[PDB]
Structure formats: C-alpha cells, structure tokens
Ligand binder design. Structure first.
Ligand SMILES: Cc1cc(C)c(CCNC(=O)[C@@H](N)Cc2c[nH]c3ccccc23)c(C)c1
Length: 330
C-alpha cells in the first residue's frame, strides 16, 4: 500500500504545517502537525477542558463506531519548549490519504498547554519518530508509520515541505519526480528515539564550505534551524545589523535585509537553504526588526534540523531494518 497527503503551512511564515487526517467511523477529519520529533498521535477532543479549546476541530470518540477506549491507558507529553498535553487513549481507524491503519492509538487530550490552545489551526500532532518515545502508559503504543510499515510497498515516508506553499507527505514510495539530482542517504542513530544524524558541514552564502560534524535531529515539528553557536554567529555576521537579543530570545535582523543562503552537508552532497527561507518576519506587529530562522541550539542540548532546513530538501525517512535518512535537492 501507499498513501499521499498534501501538507499546508498554517500561516504566512510557515510556522508549522498541517496535514488532514481521517479518524473514526464515519470519518472525522482533523488537521494534524506531522512531527518527526515525537511519537504520539494526539488530538483535541470532546474530553479536552472546554476553556482550553479555542477554534480547533475536536475528535469525538463517542460518535465513532470503531473507537474503543484503551482501558487504563493515559498519556502525558512535555515538549522541550515548555508546551505539553495529556489525556486518555482510544484505538480507532486512522487514514492519511489512501493509507489506513485499524486499531491505531489515538491519544485524546484532556489537557493542553496555552500555546496549543492559542493555535486554532493545529488540531493535534501525528508523531513520526520511533515508537520507543511513545508516552502511553502503562502499555506503550506504536506510531502510525510503525503500524503501517509492514503493509507499505517500501518501509519509508517522505517529507516535501513547501516554502510559502503546500507540499506533500508520502508513505510507502519515493516520488522520483519530486527532486533534482539524486538522494544521498546518511546514517541514523535511533538510541534516543529520534531521527538523529550527522551533517558534514556548512557554508554561508557563497562562502567556503566548512567540513565539520554536526549531530542533530530531523524534526518536521520544529519551525527553525537550531545549530551550534559558532555556526550561527558565522551566519548572522554576514547580515548588517543582525544581533543576538536576550530580551527577544535569539538573533534578530533588520527587516530591510536580504539574507544570504545557508548550505548544510549530507555526506558529500549539499542542501542550499535560500536566504528568504530564513526570514520569520517582525518580532512584534509593526516592528522593523525581524526574527531569524537560524538560531543557537546552545540552550536546547541538541541541534535541530527543523522546517527551515527540511523544506529546502526532499527528505526520505527510511524505516528499513537499519533506518537511514535521505536528502535530495528540489
Ligand atoms: C528549549 C527548546 C526549544 C525548542 C523550540 C525545542 C524544539 C521543540 N519542538 C518540538 O518538540 C516539536 N517536535 C513538537 C512541538 C513542540 N511544541 C509544538 C507546538 C506546536 C507544534 C509542534 C510542537 C526544544 C526541544 C527545546
């Protein structure tokens, strides 16, 4: 089998991407944030504290003839940025395009933190990291991809995120028309539960490529590109007036700037992030200071190749017996 669904930026800055997902019988369609940095499929629901719902579409398991409460199962997730959610668990039928998993764990939120409430465009997250990170207790549950993998024509999914435009998540096949050149594959460590890999270096604009190992995760659920402070300083030094602001929380730059590109290495291959991808707009409404899309990882503990980097590439998440990551230009 295969599946294919269009993923759409939630706003004019590409702050996140939402993909329609069918849950239950009859189908309830929710717009989920496909997150290769976590492993829980959780949704706003009829159980969610009413004051914590503000425009999201909810899953109502009592209206699904295939939903079954997973007795005694609860979940609770604390993302590294300080957001969180928790609740109870149903098994139900979940489809992404033409791809269907019966008996998928659907984690129904009873509580969400304020940032999720305040984002009316995201109805939940669909985790695509490794199932060892799943938070359901006392019986850990599998991700949608893990459940689907044996049925897929090939045990893969691909992320093709657009810049200010829709893109595509494919399951079970590689669309050879969706990229230029070839796909370069690179090793993955699964020990921490992430799609953890090592970039071979970077360049700023037309500058000389620096060969240096940069360990990090491929995380479709993170907006920005978070890299070591040395790398980030080298980038913003090329932008007149850019500076790291403690009050704002990272590098800011004049909104009148035209930004240089940023290149990262995948083996001997190179992915070029165009400069415009690194502009995340005014720091506050009406400001002439803009927030940078490349930021220091120093306070995080790991480098994060988030959407800023991933949207410049066609990315293969290869779930073969030994997982690997593939990147192509597009
Ligand atoms: C200090 C610090 C700061 C950041 C930015 C991060 C990355 C957080 N990014 C995720 O954890 C996403 N994989 C998932 C995610 C978290 N919050 C969301 C809100 C909306 C949509 C998706 C999500 C970490 C690990 C640590």
């Amino acid at each position: 089998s295969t599946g294919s669904a269009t993923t759409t930026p939630i706003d004019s800055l590409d702050d996140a991407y939402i993909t329609p997902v069918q849950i239950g019988t009859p189908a309830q369609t929710l717009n989920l944030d496909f997150d290769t940095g976590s492993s829980d499929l959780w949704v706003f629901s009829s159980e969610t504290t009413a004051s914590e719902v503000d425009g999201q579409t909810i899953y109502t398991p009592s209206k699904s003839t295939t939903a079954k409460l997973l007795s005694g199962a609860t979940w609770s997730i604390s993302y590294g940025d300080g957001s969180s959610s928790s609740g109870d668990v149903y098994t139900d039928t979940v489809s992404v395009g033409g791809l269907t998993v019966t008996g998928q764990a659907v984690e129904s939120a009873k509580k969400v933190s304020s940032s999720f409430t305040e984002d009316s465009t995201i109805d939940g997250l669909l985790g695509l990291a490794f199932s060892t990170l799943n938070t359901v207790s006392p019986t850990q549950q599998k991700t949608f991809f893990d459940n689907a993998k044996a049925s897929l024509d090939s045990p893969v999914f691909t992320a093709d995120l657009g810049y200010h435009a829709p893109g595509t998540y494919n399951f079970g096949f590689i669309d050879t028309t969706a990229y230029t050149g070839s796909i370069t594959y690179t090793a993955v460590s699964t020990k921490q539960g992430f799609w953890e890999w090592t970039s071979t270096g970077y360049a700023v604009g037309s500058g000389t490529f620096k060969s240096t190992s940069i360990d990090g995760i491929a995380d479709t659920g993170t907006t920005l590109l978070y890299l070591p402070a040395t790398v980030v300083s080298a980038y913003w030094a090329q932008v007149s007036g850019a500076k790291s602001s403690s009050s704002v929380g990272g590098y800011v730059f004049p909104c009148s700037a035209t930004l240089p590109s940023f290149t990262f290495g995948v083996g001997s291959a190179r992915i070029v992030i165009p400069g415009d991808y690194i502009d995340f707009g005014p720091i506050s409404t009406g400001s002439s200071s803009c927030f940078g899309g490349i930021q220091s990882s120093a306070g995080i503990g790991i480098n994060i190749f988030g959407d800023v980097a991933l949207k410049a590439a066609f990315v293969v998440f290869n779930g073969a017996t030994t997982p690997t990551l593939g990147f192509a230009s597009k």
